[PDB]
């Protein structure tokens, strides 16, 4: 499992973009994406062809005295969705390459906690239980992964987050270069300049034919969709960027990363033998990140017990 | 879980607004949102185009001797729904940031109560049971969150409620600026002035064409929908505002916030050692709010026992 | 749970009114709510427009020598349904405000009775069982709610019932002012004066057009629906009114409210120590109503035991 | 539960009448309930209007040298269904008012019998079991209901049955006054006089129009439905009437009502102390009817044991 | 339950007749039951009316040099189905009136046998088991029903069977009087005289109209259905008649009715005390039929044990 | 249950014939079973009538210089299916008449074997188990059926098989007399003489009309179906005939019927007392067939044990 804070905006982003793309493709593959009218005569076969013709071939707009992105929006959107989903796969491949495994360990500690957090018998001996079964498992995983490219796992995660933020900004750029910078156009539309006093974003366009005046139905759903995707992509971008900055400052500092651990270790009413600094040096590279992931998935109570137990038996290094 | 009193009007509000928006969009995307009639001749292709033309392009109304919001209602409504749902997400993110966790603790005490409120054996020793398992959990959570930005959690909640009330009023304003103040128009309609003696809210409108007289079907479902959304939004707004005022006066007073707790503590037939004031100072910032949430979700009986037990073991501070 | 006697006519009323409203709206949104015929010529586009025109615009009726409520029935009906559902929500909010909680207590005693009314072992000690587990719960609830605005809960209930009866009469008035007083019209229809010798309730009406003779299909389903809703609303109104009068006389008398309790207490073959009057004064405001609700939901047998047990341990007041 | 003998013809009656009414309404709301033919010309819009016109407006029939009940059959039928369902609701409300409760007691004895009629251990002590658990419950119910308007419960039931029989006859009268007395018309149809040599029941009728000769499809399904409903309603009526007479003679006699009880009490090979007459006077008003209901729902074997046990412990009166 | 031998031809008969009737009604209510052709001109509205006209009004047939049962077959068939189902209901009502109950007893002995025919422990003591639980139940039922109109239950059953056979023959007569006696017509069709050299059973018929030559599609499915229903009804009739004769000779003889019982009683290797004749006189009226029903439903093995046990304890009479 | 070897070709035969018949009936009841073309003019109502006319009335075929079985194939096929299903019902009725019951006994021994063929405890005492429970049941059934027309049950089975084979041949004859003997026609079609150089099996046929040239679509699916049904029916016929011959030679010989039994009895390493001939005479008429059925349904291993056990306790005759 994994409940990464606001890295699950890949999920919602993929869903929203893919549903928009599928809706638009089903629209201009099922319904009528255009209508045409020449003022001479029809036979229900003129129009059924001029529709496809004026749609495929370009159209141009004029005021009432050749913008054609109809062929790229509902495809660039699916490509955006795929590129938003990629970074999660990157992180999973990277954790597979790191030697360790987070899914197994988190699921294991979760199952143990859900098994015997309720049993009234296993609650007075609350810390001995965590000291017996799951902490030995976590320590065995640490000791087994320590000998295979797991001393920079935090670096791998923060690199994945850098990739995620850069990807968000690149998707935003790809969107805004598909035609002006958003709220200017919105204010132009909020003041009452809809499309005939604007030029861009047309809905009544003439057609070349060797004066066909075809109307674009779909174009009413686009500029009510860019107005929204702009806001939502910029929000996603700044959220992922503040997450990236938090993680990079976490990694670089290395001194205020042990805040939560030192606060956890100040609860067990023993303080038996082992100083923190030797414990941390025993838990330096990886465990400082595994404990963070455990705190993120399980909570704080079922993680303070874990990190206390992992101190009471730290004997593989010191 | 959470059963917040009349903060679950975000749920019903989102549902009603989104279902209205989806119904209107499906209507003027499937059925015919307009009909047109010119008194010369038709070919089943004149009308199938003039419909879209007169719909996209503006229309104007005249008496029987250019109001066009057709392009903003079924979108502003979905935006309203989203903005109504936002504050719940704000509160969840804020409680995640507060350090503590309400969902876990409330679910835990609920599960414990539902497990052994029925077992006849665990009912004579009713208070020792609550003193053993769940109260220790709550106290451990308090002591662990006390060291991480959890001393103003009530302030965070009341700030969320301020945001919710302001949002309700802003949604009401957005609605009423989409065209006069409600019951005036209703009385004008209750006295028998439907639309031809009114001007606004038309259903038979002429169309420019280089005398088309197009009829707007949908416009019969709008002014039977604004009349209702006005009432419902003002009701939601005043309810959320009285909730906000209750919470802000709760936080500001700090003296009549301990009413329910002092009334709970006057039931256990012991009154063993610990004065209330030291107990309250031990439970000052957070616990006074956790107990309120417990009373709100579980009831009063399975909360009086909890707050009594949490007094009989208060030894982390005093 | 709750099985309130003939307050569950809010359920059936909401269902019938809402299903009628939805049927009529789906009818004149899917089928043809009107047909028109001019004796000149058609093109399958004249009629498809004149239908909507003559429907939206008014129509007028003449004998064979401008009644238009088509735009208010299938909406006023949904509003009626909502206003019928309101009073149950009022009662639930009021019981939440009263401090006590009926749902929890009734469900608890029901679950206890359904658990050990069958077990043959727990039947000789039938009264000791009710004296141990559930009666202590009920008394704890009473003692905890006594200190928070629960001394007029019967008044709250009877106020809700007053509201319900007034609402029934107001809905009846709203219906009858939508056009004569019912059985007069019915007898006029039972003697063989259908619509052409009556004037009102037309089905063949002329239409203005700058002699269209449009027929109103739907109008055959209305005056076969008012004839029924009149009867049903007056029945609901008088039932709710006799319930309201019963409750108001219950509350006002305060002396023949203790009939069922004094009859229950005359069964346990002990009559141990406690006089009734001190018991009643200990159970004065609230418990006299909780016992009534228990009798209403569970029955009489699983309530006589309850009220006997609650006498054998009455020691919080006397 | 309840398996009332041939009072469950309310169930089958409601089903048959409601399904007929729904079928006819769906027929002349979906299909074509009439067809018209004028020998001049059509345009697929003449007929689509003349259908509704000649249907709503009256029609008249002539031989081949203004009967119109099309607007009352598929509504009077639904009203009949409702009025057939009413008496069961009357009986349930009356038993709720009687103070006692039959559903609970019958379900209880049924559950007890189904639990331990199979267990081989609880079969030698067959009568002690019935004497312990369920008979005490029945006696407690009797003693608790005796003090609240339960001394005429048999009178309430027989009054409900009187109402049911009168209702059956009134429904039959309502049917036969909708147009001759049944088998006369049937024999007229069995001898080969279908409709043109009869006058009534037409299928080819002329239409007023300022010689349209409209054909009535539906009228082929009516006089094949009255022929059946007549028979079925008269059968239901006489069955309910013989049931009513049986019950009224039961109540009035009061002496041959104790036949089944005296025959039950002649099986237990003890005849311990209690004479029948004192037992009956202890069981006079109500229990003589509860035992009948038990015999009707459970059978005779699981009721003879019950009435024997209720004799072996009759000590509340004698 | 009940597995009556070839009285379950009411089930298959009702199914076949009702499915045929429903198929034919759906056919000439959905598809086209007739087609018409006049050699002048059509407008897709001439034929859509002449179909209904020539269908409702009669048609007549002529050779190539007014038979109309289209309006009675798919209704008389449903009536036949109902009248075939009736006798089972007669038998159930009659067994309810007899005082005894077969369903309960047969289900009880079946459940007991299915419970402990497999358990290896309860198989050496095979006859003591049947002597303990179920035989006492059967004897109690006999002794309780003996005092209420159960001494002619075999007569009731054989009367029901008489009714069933008479009903079968009457249904056959009703069919054959709907137009010649079957195999004559079949042979006329087996020798190659289809319909134009026969007169009856037409498929091309002229129509009166003030030379329309309408073709009857359905008439191809009728005379391929009478040919089958004749055979099947005569088979059902003779089967039910031989069953009736078997039962009437069973009842009348009264001496070769005790064959199976005397053959059962010759297996238990005890022959303890009780002569058969006294046993039979103790089991004279009813039990001789209950044992037959048990043999019919359960088999012979789980009935020989039953009738042996019921001999080893016969002490209510002798 | 029953797994009769290649008597379950009644199942597959009924399925194939009924699915073919239903497909053809749905074809010429839904689609177009014929098309017609006169070279003058059409109006979409000429053809919609000439189709039915030329279909019902006969057609005749001519070469390119009145075969009509369209009205008997898809009915004779359903009749064939019914007559194929009959013999299984004959066998079930005959086994019901025989006095014994095979379904019960086979299901019983199957359930016993499936219960304790796996339990490791009940496998060393493998033969004592079969000697205790099921063999006693089989012997009791034999002894109880021996006194009621069960001494020729093998004769009944072989008579049923004679009926089945005769029925197969009669169905084959009915098919081949519906028009030449199969592979002659196939070879005529395998050499390239499709239909115009053949005469029979036409697809382009002229129509009488007071030169219509109607084409028969369906006739392309018939002579691709007779070619298959001929082969399949002859295969079924010879299979059922060799089965019949096997059974008749089995019954007639009576000496090589005891082969399998004598081979079974040569496995138990005891050969305790009872000679085979006395055992066989004790098991002469019926048991020799029951053992065969058991071998056929269960296998050989769970039948050798059975027939050994039934020898070790044969004491009802010798």
mmCIF file of C-alpha atoms in Angstrom, chain F residues 22 24 33 36 56 59 71 76 78 102-103 115 119 135 141 157 163 211 228 246 280 292 297 318:
data_model
loop_
_atom_site.group_PDB
_atom_site.id
_atom_site.type_symbol
_atom_site.label_atom_id
_atom_site.label_comp_id
_atom_site.label_asym_id
_atom_site.label_seq_id
_atom_site.Cartn_x
_atom_site.Cartn_y
_atom_site.Cartn_z
ATOM 1 C CA UNK F 22 -36.203 -22.934 -32.715
ATOM 2 C CA UNK F 24 -35.624 -21.959 -38.112
ATOM 3 C CA UNK F 33 -38.005 -16.038 -45.369
ATOM 4 C CA UNK F 36 -40.013 -11.300 -54.550
ATOM 5 C CA UNK F 56 -48.106 -19.370 -47.830
ATOM 6 C CA UNK F 59 -44.270 -22.165 -55.394
ATOM 7 C CA UNK F 71 -44.367 -25.719 -43.746
ATOM 8 C CA UNK F 76 -41.554 -32.092 -37.600
ATOM 9 C CA UNK F 78 -39.740 -30.284 -32.703
ATOM 10 C CA UNK F 102 -32.443 -46.856 -8.445
ATOM 11 C CA UNK F 103 -31.961 -43.117 -7.985
ATOM 12 C CA UNK F 115 -17.929 -39.162 2.571
ATOM 13 C CA UNK F 119 -10.847 -40.202 5.758
ATOM 14 C CA UNK F 135 -24.915 -52.904 2.181
ATOM 15 C CA UNK F 141 -34.312 -52.494 -0.540
ATOM 16 C CA UNK F 157 -34.766 -52.146 -18.850
ATOM 17 C CA UNK F 163 -38.245 -49.091 -27.536
ATOM 18 C CA UNK F 211 -43.610 -14.237 -63.398
ATOM 19 C CA UNK F 228 -25.900 -33.419 -41.485
ATOM 20 C CA UNK F 246 -25.871 -56.123 -26.113
ATOM 21 C CA UNK F 280 -26.433 -65.822 -6.912
ATOM 22 C CA UNK F 292 -24.387 -53.511 -12.718
ATOM 23 C CA UNK F 297 -22.337 -45.010 -11.895
ATOM 24 C CA UNK F 318 -29.328 -68.439 2.299
#
